Amino acid sequence: PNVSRTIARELKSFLLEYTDETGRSVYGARIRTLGEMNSESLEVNYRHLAESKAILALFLAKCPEEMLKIFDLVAMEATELHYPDYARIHSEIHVRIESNLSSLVRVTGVVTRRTGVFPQLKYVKFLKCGSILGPFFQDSNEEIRIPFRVNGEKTVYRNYQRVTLQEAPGTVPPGRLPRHREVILLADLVDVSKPGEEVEVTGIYKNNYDGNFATIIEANSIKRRETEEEEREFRKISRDRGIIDKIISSMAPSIYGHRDIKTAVACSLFGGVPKNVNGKHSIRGDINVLLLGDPGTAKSQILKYVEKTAHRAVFATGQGASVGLTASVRKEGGALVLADKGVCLIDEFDKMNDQDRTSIHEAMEQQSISISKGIVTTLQARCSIIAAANPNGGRYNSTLPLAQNVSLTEPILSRFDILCVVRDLVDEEADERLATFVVDSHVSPIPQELLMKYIHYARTKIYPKLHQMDMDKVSRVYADLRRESISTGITVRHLESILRIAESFAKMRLSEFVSSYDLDRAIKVVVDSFVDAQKVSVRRQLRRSFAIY
């Protein structure tokens, strides 16, 4: 088909004047940002192409091969009319997008093992006819074959990688066995997946020529399974004051109340800062959440909300049913390796063995676990651990203490920062509100798309610091809290937690400076939380928590 010559003029009538939601040429506004970042990639939604001119959708399923070769070069010249000197960067931008041959296919799967990255010839130049032959094209997975021979020099290369992909164990019909298929990577997509993931790729489907037919999928657009005005309109809203209670009010509308423990969980995933001193040492960068449950609670529903909204979350089972959080060479990183700079979800400590005790022990303290294995490396782990426990026998035994109530030991609790505890007592109106909001559940807060851009945009950018004039009250708080709780029995790590929790409130305002309000909220959340763990004789502690305010 030679008509694509004339179609190249008209395919830019879609590129730079795609008027949707009052004009807004997302492609034309995007190109200046593409060459701005030198990403050498342009994204094309199948919705927009199907919406404007579906003749190209036919040109996708029938001939996806040469259509890209015609589309990317015109995108190159269409970008160079915008940037006069962009050809000095890369000068080539590749684009993104039996009944299966010669078509683009939306494919799912799980990443099996793979290989390294090698360069591959792109330009082929060739003693028979005097001098060299001339430039020729390096076919993909095929030779040129124009006596002469290819020389070592004068060869422009291209990085290559092939990726094995096998079927996803999640949508397997139950009991059958998975099968395999080949995926080959190209330039900007070099080594994008990682073992232990799922993936959704947009591939063109080919087959081998002859052997002396195996099919190979070359892939175009990798998307993982689930702009300028987008962050500035975002900043027009983020300037307000009452976002504190609103975050908890926008955190989890399924169960309506419980603002305190919901604010603590919302603070946990929002992160802390380890703040490595220049040359000296790094302290700790995570917030530790324990939530002592009760049968008869939808506390698990909360952590499921945590897993869908947050970045990397692998649900760690109750007892050995899964992944195992400790990487080990078996016939290879653990799930904690997947959750780097993310939040892990580990629960039901009552039924977890010592393997988990060592992994969780070292990971929340100083991030790295070593062995008595024939390889010696130090892989760290910056996970964030959120637990959900269960009381022994009764949900709450008596006035007897928390350490007497729980079956764990003291140092594992020491690794923990916050202790949110729920209570079960017969309230008539709470049951009324509960049943009525349940009815509403079967029928002002931030929409979930804005909050996900909020936490992702915040954790990559907001970097809290602190001044030296406001921590003296805090020093007095630690001094009275430790020195007065001597008669009670205490955590020095909770001293570091003060700054590491309070820094998140400055992360909430994206102000980079810790106001007094942040310290006051951090004190009013930590102190009373420690208060709630005692006996009925806590009245005295209630009568000394005034000076605390």
């Binding site: 006069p84 960067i89 102000s511 980079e512």
Partner: protein, 295 residues
């Protein structure tokens, strides 16, 4: 542009005082605008990070044409000047400006009332290291000061951003007034010259202009020795648009207020623009400064 020959063009603009306010480098808006200038230059980010010595010859020869073809977009058209460059041959050429900045940086680093006088003695002690530094052949010591100049400019622009977030400026009609009562790395602020260039770095930043009515800035800091709070005078900088013989104001005002009760005031500073004052007494000093305003 500053620190041209010994540093990356990226850091050169990043720490550039002239480029600072126009591009609003402290804020995130101009960040992309800076990369946009490089996108006009067609320079890879990694190419900008390399040392000036190892950058390609093409990039060298074409630098000025590229500047002529790109920077004008941001109003930078009047920059290129025919300034002199020394040829010492084999160790490489340097514009007089850069060597000046390095030597003055060598002046400020690279080193009851008895401690303050002891420190004053140490300032004079650092002068001979500079007088010795004036020779061409003694390069060993010179490179240390050359690099420490970068360490200063880093701290300057950093604390500068910190001041930009709190907006402690009192935009008054008479004159702008500010004070830094607390902050990290206050030891470097002991030298008056630190605050001289610091004030200059602010003065051009807050007002480009940015019409109208350029106003003087007030600045002070203290750590020990009972609220020394050196306050040095500062004057507005015009962006080429000596239009008038304005010069200064403060000498007469200092004579008027120092002629009053003047308790604990010390005129010990050789330069008339800077004076030591107690904060307790600096507040009324300000009150008397506002009114009667001599200007």
């Amino acid at each position: 542009l500053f620190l041209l020959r010994h540093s990356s063009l990226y850091d050169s603009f990043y720490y550039s005082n002239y480029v600072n306010a126009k591009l609003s480098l402290w804020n995130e808006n101009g960040k992309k605008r800076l990369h946009k200038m490089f996108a006009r230059m067609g320079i890879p980010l990694s190419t900008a990070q390399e040392t000036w010595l190892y950058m390609d010859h093409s990039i060298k020869r074409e630098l000025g044409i590229i500047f002529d073809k790109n920077l004008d977009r941001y109003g930078l058209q009047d920059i290129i000047r025919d300034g002199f460059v020394r040829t010492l041959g084999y160790r490489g050429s340097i514009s007089a400006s850069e060597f000046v900045e390095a030597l003055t940086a060598l002046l400020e680093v690279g080193n009851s009332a008895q401690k303050l006088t002891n420190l004053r003695k140490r300032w004079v002690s650092n002068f001979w290291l500079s007088w010795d530094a004036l020779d061409d052949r003694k390069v060993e010591l010179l490179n240390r000061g050359i690099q420490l100049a970068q360490d200063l400019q880093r701290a300057i622009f950093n604390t500068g951003v910190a001041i930009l977030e709190k907006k402690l400026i009192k935009h008054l009609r008479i004159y702008r007034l500010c004070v830094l009562q607390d902050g990290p790395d206050l030891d470097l602020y002991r030298n008056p010259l630190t605050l001289l260039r610091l004030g200059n770095w602010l003065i051009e930043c807050c007002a480009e202009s940015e019409d109208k009515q350029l106003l003087p800035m007030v600045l002070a800091s203290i750590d020990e020795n009972t609220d020394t709070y050196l306050v040095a005078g500062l004057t507005p900088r015009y962006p080429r648009g000596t239009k008038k013989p304005i010069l200064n104001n403060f000498s007469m005002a200092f004579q008027q207020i120092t002629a009053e009760t003047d308790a604990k005031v010390r005129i010990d500073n050789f330069e008339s623009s800077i004076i030591e004052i107690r904060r307790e007494d600096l507040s009324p000093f300000l009150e008397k400064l506002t009114l009667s305003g001599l200007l």
